[PDB]
A paper describes a structure:
GFP is a relatively small, inert, non-toxic globular protein that readily diffuses throughout cells and can be genetically encoded allowing non-invasive fluorescence visualization of target cells or proteins in live and fixed samples. GFP is a small, folded protein and the entirety of the β-barrel structure is required for chromophore formation and fluorescence. Recently, we applied Cellular High-throughput Encapsulation, Solubilisation and Screening (CHESS)-based directed evolution to superfolder GFP (sfGFP) and identified a GFP variant, termed ultra-stable GFP (usGFP), with superior stability when subjected to SDS and high temperatures.
As our solution biophysical data indicated that usGFP displayed significant dimerisation, we sought to design a variant of usGFP that remains monomeric. A point mutation at this interface was introduced to generate a monomeric ultra-stable GFP (muGFP) variant. The crystal structure of muGFP was solved at 1.8 Å resolution and contained two molecules in the asymmetric unit. The crystallographic interface between these two molecules was altered in muGFP compared with usGFP, and generation of symmetry mates within the lattice failed to provide any crystal contacts that resembled the usGFP dimer interface. This suggested that the F223D mutation sufficiently disrupted the dimeric interface observed in usGFP. Examination of L69 in muGFP showed that this residue had a similar orientation to L69 of usGFP. Importantly, the water molecule observed near Q69 in sfGFP was also absent in muGFP. Y164 of muGFP also showed an altered rotamer with respect to Y164 of usGFP, and did not form hydrogen bonds with K166 and D180, but rather, a hydrogen bond was formed between K166 and D180. muGFP Y182 formed a hydrogen bond with K162, which was not observed in usGFP. The absence of concentration dependent increase in the weight average sedimentation coefficient indicates the absence of self-association of muGFP in this concentration range and suggests that the F223D mutation was sufficient to prevent dimer formation. Critically, introduction of the single mutation F223D to disrupt the dimer had no effect on the fluorescence characteristics of muGFP, and only a slight effect on the stability of muGFP with respect to usGFP.
Residue numbers in the entry: 1 to 64, 68 to 234
The structure:
Amino acid sequence: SSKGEELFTGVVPILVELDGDVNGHKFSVRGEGEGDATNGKLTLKFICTTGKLPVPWPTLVTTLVLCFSRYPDHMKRHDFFKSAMPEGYVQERTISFKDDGTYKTRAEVKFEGDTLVNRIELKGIDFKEDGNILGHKLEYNFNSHNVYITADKQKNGIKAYFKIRHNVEDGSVQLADHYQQNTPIGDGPVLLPDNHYLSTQSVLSKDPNEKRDHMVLLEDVTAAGITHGMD
Ligand SMILES: [Cl-]
């Protein structure tokens, strides 16, 4: 157990702030809600504060707080994300969309007061203007995934590897290959994990009285051991 884990005991407010620029189409997203790490549960509504989101909402789910993952008792000694709190961690990804562009993201995840804040910069390049992403051809849904986590001893953080398959409106799938690196912001000790999985489940919806372009997300995330965590 870490000291940082103690910050997660009950329900914690979350603020997510994302500035994006994909093929020169700029946007901002703000997320508001709460996290319950005991149960591995997140409740968030995200609004595009610049008006129309120029990419599909499902392509931003992974970018838009793994510190709310439920680590079973016997895996708590492997929970990097909470151990890095309150000072927090940097999270970087390259997300490669098969036969289309790439997103590069850099986020800082830390507490500000009693709120957990995820502040992200996203830059996408090499997208097709007519493709599945800039052409909004993806279905509004998000399937369950398995994130593979490994220690990065030299950086005293973690790497993660996973694939997201987004359903396309014509019945095809759009792959998005995720490469991820996390490093702590503070100088204090953290917990480095053995290899494991995070098992994820996500429900996307709309708030019927919300006029702005938005996404309501319910997410469940639980850590799982190495033998069966792939499915
Ligand atoms: Cl969408």
